[PDB]
Design a binder for this molecule. Structure first.
Ligand SMILES: Nc1nc2c(ncn2[C@@H]2O[C@H](COP(=O)(O)OP(=O)(O)OP(=O)(O)O)[C@@H](O)[C@H]2O)c(=O)[nH]1
Ligand SMILES: *[C@H]1C(=O)c2c(O)cccc2C(=O)[C@@H]1C
Ligand SMILES: *[C@H]1C(=O)c2c(O)cccc2C(=O)[C@@H]1C
Ligand SMILES: [Cl-]
Ligand SMILES: [Cl-]
Ligand SMILES: [Mg+2]
Ligand code: NA
Lengths: 208, 130, 1017
């Protein structure tokens, strides 16, 4: 059971960051522009079994756009992403939406204002009304703080499975290998463990 | 009168220690820590084998970011940046499927928590020997 | 194998193209990524368009044909005018021919809706280029072809829908003003023929797919067509009856009727008003008979989420609110329309109970619009009493968490500390309070009775829950200001008394934490009450002290924040002695300050002293205030005194990481009190000032010693972050004090010199990674408040920070982000307040100033970019103010054209669209400099151009050269016409900007019309 998801929006809005946070748990701080599209399998566990999204993470920068609306063909759902610290990225939400619905009439779509963790917010909550008439779900999100980071996938899962009571649930946990190699007998230990100790953990001023 | 008619794999385990934590893995290629998840770190003692594992699930997704035996062989080490973290090499974590090796770092909310974790981590290691 | 299609020397293998496309869309992993890169290169190849005819004929893969049209779409939009006439005609023919062929095969028309809607968009691109000037009979012939086939009739409704979209909804950004006006005028001329075709299908049309597509085209027409097409035909009756009964046409009709409820319409004509009433009567009738009655549980319907119910209830909400906001006055006077007015409002009441934040906000906007009109508009509120009464319950029962409430329930069901701020929730709470405040004024007895009786059902435990005590308390708090002192007196007394009973009764830390957060929200919201009732205020304050001793971090944290909040408004009632009291309450608080704060974490203790600061600043007798201040600071001054006798007896006791923490907490305590006392902090600041600057120096050496002994990695260690925190907090304390100081003499004569001596050299002479950005912030506040009094001090700041900070930030846009920001803030204030300092730079360094400003333009960091453009604007004005003197003349010869071309580059590169307004304003100010002959010497060099010829003439010659080489696809005449227009418009910003946006369109295509730049003239 797998569904095509296209993720669209202006460059720098946090699409690839949002996806990477869901794939690996990581917070990517650098801006490495997506070239055309990158496809990533993402599975969630639900009270109605596993749901899989083939996530088509697309380029927001015109000069890196690649196949553009060519990526939307046969999409079963979508996320439009803008940046609450950048008014131009919200002003472009209608253009992304147009390009998307001309290829994907009648699919479920989430509008996401990313970077709500940032103090000096430019696109205020009261400005954000574009989703009403176009029947999009809207969420304030942060890939950095993880605020509402699960909601886009939870809402879409609910609409694609047609069950509004669908919850994420605790993925099963098999008993891990009890026989393991002593890592201290593997030579590169001293080289790997010194590098790791003397590289500082990021964000030592966070609460965790 | 007839009535109107109507598995995590943690049910066989006991919770010895619970603490809120952020877990990282070291990417040797990039030489940077990358977060693997934030949530409850649990020490789970299997009631049948008395084996103690780390199990840790990300908040909201509840997805496993750590599943491994608290091996006698492993050693907690400080990290230059932090008085509230430990670093260690794990040779068999199954969070993301097949047995892989990782260099983990785990940070806590306070030095007290990190010192408690270390104390509990070594208690579980004694339990795993017997 | 797949790479074959990229080799254009051979014939395109179409079977291979189709495999590469299949692999991409249907495959996975490396194969899919490989295919993706091959297709992107195929598509970008600028001769790929010559293959599209081949792909559309021979491909067995719709997605291959989709991509052929993408390739054509890029050619049509960008290079069309360079194609010779035969190639444009030919491409026109096989798009039109492909579309018709696809419609006339029923199986293709059914299964290939993607490929047809892409062909239709591609055709509309050709219309934007060719129609109507080289295709005058397009519209008549489209009308012609419609009757040949039901499929072609329907597809032609999609073509006109797309054409309307591209010309009226999406033209503003993608065409010149002149070309949007041309295509608007062109469609307006032929709409009569288009509407009659649209109207015939609505009356006579059989096919549901054809009806739906026709009405979709009408939604688009309603954005711009004149009302006479809607009001002077039968279309309103059709939409409001027939098209509402069928569920397959109901969504789009309801969206059409929403747009109609906005059409531009005369408000002085009884018959247009009757027709506006009628379509509403008709639509509400169809909903009540065909979809659901007024009494239906829309909440449950929405939750069940069958078929399109959520969409429909959303569109209904939008229709009712749009229509009623504009036209409810039409239903308010006529007694025969009363039932229809109240039923419509009852539908919104039921919609407002739906569990869905965004819908709830949509309805709440409407409720605000209504209750605001009922507050002001005479003789109206009696109509809506029963609606308003139901709305009070809906809102009181769906109040969301205010900012101030720091306790919250997690997904394992524990009452815990709030992890983060919910801006979404905070705004929603404020929107809810605006409505509920209005409703309370409309009927203050109804609001009290609902709240009082809900409280009674928490008391006796019948409706008791965390949700229910929370929503009641938030609501009770949200209405402060709505009642008389008298009803407020009794209301609040009853609420406080009864809530204290809930706290005293209920058991367990979860229950106590909830009730306590509610007590604290309420008393926090009623300062007026607390002012007048010393005993209550005293006991609330004494109760806030009890909560500061709770085990639950949330309850404690909120106690401190409530204390601040109460004290900001009631400060006077702590500073004086009340009747029946031994001393002013301030003095009792200051005595027990160690006992009452014992169980608080440090940053909460700091909040507590800030609160004491606010009280203390209410005392205006200078004697008493300096004393109260000295009395408050006893604990931290006593710690400071003992820490400074040890710390100067040997520089090595600071190594103690415990002592670094104690020290930073003492400076943080001073930062807190200074924040609230501002200019009244001077005495306490001076008790520590010279010893504190010596600690700054001591701490600074240890930082440098650690980096040299241990390497850069030392900056990451707890020890060094602890030491750097002492430096940051000291900078912050001085920054805070100087920002608020009234006695600026003392600042320049006592504070500035020792500060600059303590910080500047230490910043300049540390390695980049050891430099604290807070130094630049501190210096910005110093320059801002006293810059004008310390010209040489500003020179000294520039020399210490300018070149070395620039070298840190000028290799890339990412590294040293805080430095980059504080840096450009420092140069803005200096260039604003103390510009003489830049005159005293050596020419090499002034050149780095100009490079730094232009570097700021090219940032996508808004904090840097806005400062960059402001500095450039302020500099140009500074220079102009000097008049005809050598430094200004040298400035213009050296830097005028660098500013013009650097502003043009960020205008036209498409990576800085956020700064368009300020860029345009800068470019305008620069061009206008030359016109108003403010530049006093030739900008050109000696043997370049006829002697005596003006800076005006050369500005245009330089700019024509610059754009010719930067944009060679433009014609000479396009560049000539653009500059001629741009220059004439150097006083009118809005027009100038329009000419720039016009240029930005023409540079993304070939063959732009030069005359487009005459749109304004
Ligand atoms: N503060 C903050 N920064 C964020 C957040 N999400 C992403 N960013 C940062 O913003 C930048 C955007 O990164 P990307 O995810 O590559 O942007 P993108 O939208 O994928 O851009 P393209 O691939 O060019 O379309 C990165 O430096 C991120 O670390 C967020 O929630 N908060
Ligand atoms: C096109 C059309 O198909 C049509 C149908 O199907 C029924 C009735 C009238 C018409 C038209 O006149 C439209 C041209
Ligand atoms: C202002 C202006 O800058 C200008 C230049 O520079 C050259 C020629 C004409 C003009 C104007 O008419 C504008 C008033
Ligand atoms: Cl906001
Ligand atoms: Cl071009
Ligand atoms: Mg990306
Ligand atoms: Na109307």
């Amino acid at each position: 059971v797998q569904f095509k998801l296209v993720l669209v929006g202006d460059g720098g809005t946090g699409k690839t960051t949002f996806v990477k946070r869901h794939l690996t748990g990581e917070f990517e701080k650098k801006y490495v522009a997506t070239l055309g599209v990158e496809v990533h399998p993402l599975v969630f566990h639900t009270n109605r079994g596993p749901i899989k999204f083939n996530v088509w993470d697309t380029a927001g920068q015109e000069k890196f756009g690649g196949l553009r609306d060519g990526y939307y063909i046969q999409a079963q759902c979508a996320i439009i992403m803008f940046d609450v610290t950048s008014r131009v990225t919200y002003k472009n939400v209608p253009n992304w939406h147009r390009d998307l619905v001309r290829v994907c009439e009648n699919i479920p779509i989430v509008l996401c204002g990313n970077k709500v963790d940032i103090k000096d917010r430019k696109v205020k909550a009261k400005s954000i009304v574009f989703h009403r008439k176009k029947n999009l779900q809207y969420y304030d999100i942060s890939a950095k703080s993880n605020y509402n980071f699960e909601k886009p996938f939870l809402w879409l899962a609910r609409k694609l499975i047609g069950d509004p009571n669908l919850e994420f649930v605790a993925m099963p946990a098999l008993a891990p290998p009890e026989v393991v190699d002593d890592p201290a007998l593997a030579a590169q230990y001293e080289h790997d463990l010194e590098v790791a100790q003397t590289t500082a953990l990021p964000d030592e001023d966070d609460d965790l | 009168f007839e009535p109107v008619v109507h598995k995590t794999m943690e049910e066989d385990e006991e919770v010895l220690y619970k603490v809120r934590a952020k877990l990282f893995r070291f990417d040797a290629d990039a030489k940077e820590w990358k977060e693997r998840g934030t949530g409850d770190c649990k020490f789970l003692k299997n009631k049948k084998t008395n084996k103690v594992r780390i199990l840790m699930r990300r908040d909201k997704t509840l997805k496993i970011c750590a599943n491994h035996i608290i091996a006698p062989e492993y050693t907690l080490k400080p990290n230059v940046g932090s008085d509230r973290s430990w670093v260690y090499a794990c040779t068999a974590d199954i969070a993301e499927g097949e047995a892989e090796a990782f260099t983990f770092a785990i940070r806590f909310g306070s030095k007290e928590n990190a010192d408690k974790f270390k104390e509990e981590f070594e208690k579980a290691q004694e339990i795993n020997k017997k | 194998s797949m790479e074959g299609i990229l080799d254009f020397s051979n014939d395109l293998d179409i079977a291979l193209l189709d495999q590469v496309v299949s692999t991409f869309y249907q495959g996975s992993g490396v194969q899919q990524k490989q295919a993706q890169e091959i297709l992107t290169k195929f598509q970008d190849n600028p001769d790929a368009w010559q293959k599209a005819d081949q792909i559309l004929q021979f491909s067995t893969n719709p997605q291959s044909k989709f991509i052929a049209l993408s390739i054509l779409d890029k050619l049509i939009t960008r290079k069309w005018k360079l194609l010779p006439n035969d190639h444009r005609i030919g491409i026109r023919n096989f798009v039109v021919g492909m579309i018709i062929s696809m419609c006339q095969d029923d199986e293709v028309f059914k299964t290939q809706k993607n490929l047809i809607n892409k062909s239709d968009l591609t055709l509309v691109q050709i219309l934007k280029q060719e129609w109507p000037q080289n295709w005058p009979e397009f519209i008549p012939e489209l009308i012609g072809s419609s009757s040949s086939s039901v499929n072609v009739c329907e597809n032609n409704m999609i073509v006109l829908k797309l054409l309307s979209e591209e010309v009226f909804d999406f033209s503003a950004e993608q065409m010149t003003q002149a070309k949007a006006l041309h295509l608007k005028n062109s469609m307006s001329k032929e709409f009569e023929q288009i509407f009659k075709l649209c109207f015939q299908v609505l009356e006579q049309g059989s096919s549901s797919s054809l009806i739906v597509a026709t009405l979709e085209s009408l939604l688009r027409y309603l954005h711009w067509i004149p009302y006479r097409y809607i009001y002077e035909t039968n279309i309103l009756e059709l939409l409001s009856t027939k098209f509402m009964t069928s569920p397959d046409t109901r969504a789009i009709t309801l969206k059409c009727l929403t747009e109609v409820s906005n059409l531009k319409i005369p408000q002085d004509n009884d018959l247009i008003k009757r027709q506006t009433v009628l379509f509403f009567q008709n639509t509400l009738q169809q909903i009540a008979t065909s979809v659901m009655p007024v009494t239906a549980d829309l909440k449950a319907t929405y939750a069940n989420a069958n078929g399109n119910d959520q969409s429909f209830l959303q569109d209904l909400a939008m229709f009712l609110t749009t229509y009623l906001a504009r036209n409810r006055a039409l239903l308010e006077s006529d007694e025969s329309l009363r039932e229809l007015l109240l039923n419509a409002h009852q539908y919104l009441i039921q919609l407002s109970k739906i569990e869905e934040r965004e819908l709830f906000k949509t309805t709440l906007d409407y409720w605000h619009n209504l209750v605001a009109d009922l507050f002001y508009e005479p003789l109206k509120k009696h109509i809506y009493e029963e609606i308003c009464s139901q709305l009070r319950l809906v809102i009181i029962e769906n109040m969301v968490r205010p900012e101030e409430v720091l306790v919250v329930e997690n997904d394992e069901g524990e009452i815990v500390r709030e992890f983060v701020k919910e801006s979404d929730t905070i705004q929603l709470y404020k929107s809810e309070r605006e409505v509920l405040v209005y409703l309370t004024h409309l009927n203050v007895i109804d609001t009290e009775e609902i709240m009082i009786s809900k409280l009674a059902r928490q008391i006796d435990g019948s409706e008791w829950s965390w949700h229910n005590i929370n929503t009641l308390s938030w609501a009770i708090g949200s209405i402060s200001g709505t009642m008389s002192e008298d009803t407020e007196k009794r209301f609040v007394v009853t609420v406080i008394k009864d809530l204290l009973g809930l706290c005293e009764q209920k058991r367990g830390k979860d229950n106590k934490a909830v009730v306590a957060s509610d007590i604290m929200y309420v008393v926090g919201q009623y300062p007026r009450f607390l002012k007048a009732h010393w005993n209550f205020l005293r006991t609330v304050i004494l109760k806030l002290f009890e909560f500061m001793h709770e085990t639950h971090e949330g309850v404690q944290d909120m106690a401190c924040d409530t204390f601040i909040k109460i004290v900001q408004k009631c400060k006077y009632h702590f500073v004086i002695q009340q009747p029946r009291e031994s001393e002013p309450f301030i003095q009792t608080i200051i005595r027990d300050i160690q006992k009452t704060t014992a169980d608080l974490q440090p940053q909460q203790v700091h909040t507590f002293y800030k609160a004491c600061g606010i009280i203390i600043s209410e005392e205006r007798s200078v004697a008493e205030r300096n004393r109260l201040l000295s009395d408050l600071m006893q604990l931290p001054n006593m710690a400071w005194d003992t820490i400074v006798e040890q710390s100067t007896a040997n520089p090595t006791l600071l190594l103690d990481s415990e002592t670094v923490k104690i020290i930073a907490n003492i400076i943080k305590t001073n930062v807190a009190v200074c924040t609230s006392m501002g200019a009244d902090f001077y005495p306490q600041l001076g008790h520590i000032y010279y010893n504190m600057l010596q600690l700054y120096r001591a701490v600074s050496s240890m930082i440098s010693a650690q980096v040299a002994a241990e390497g850069l990695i030392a900056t990451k260690t707890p020890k060094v972050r602890g030491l750097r925190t002492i430096k940051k907090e000291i900078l912050k304390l001085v920054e805070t004090y100087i920002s608020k100081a009234r006695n600026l003499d003392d600042v320049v004569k006592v504070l500035v010199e020792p500060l600059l001596n303590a910080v500047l050299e230490d910043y300049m002479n540390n390695v980049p990674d050891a430099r604290d950005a807070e130094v630049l912030n501190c210096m910005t506040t110093v320059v801002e408040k006293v810059g004008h009094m310390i010209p040489q001090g500003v020179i000294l700041i520039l020399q210490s920070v300018f070149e070395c900070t620039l070298d840190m930030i000028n290799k890339d846009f990412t590294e040293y982000p805080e430095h980059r920001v504080e840096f450009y803030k420092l140069l803005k204030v200096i260039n604003e307040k103390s510009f003489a300092a830049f005159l005293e730079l050596p020419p090499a360094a002034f050149k780095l100033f100009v490079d730094a400003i232009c570097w700021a333009f090219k940032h996508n960091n808004r904090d840097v970019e806005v400062n960059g453009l402001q500095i450039a604007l302020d500099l140009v004005k500074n220079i102009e103010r000097m008049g005809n003197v050598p430094f200004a003349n040298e400035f213009h010869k050296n830097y005028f054209f660098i500013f013009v071309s650097e502003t043009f580059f960020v205008l036209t590169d498409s990576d800085h669209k956020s700064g368009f307004s300020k860029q345009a304003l800068l470019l305008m100010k620069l061009i206008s400099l030359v016109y108003d002959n403010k530049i006093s010497v030739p900008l050109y060099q000696e043997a370049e151009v006829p002697q005596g010829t003006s800076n005006q003439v050369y500005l245009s010659q330089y700019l024509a050269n610059m754009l010719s080489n930067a944009f060679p696809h433009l014609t000479s005449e396009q560049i000539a016409s653009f500059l001629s227009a741009l220059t004439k418009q150097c006083k009118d910003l809005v027009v100038f900007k329009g000419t720039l946006r016009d240029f930005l369109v023409q540079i993304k295509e070939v063959g732009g019309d030069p005359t487009d730049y005459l749109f304004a003239e």
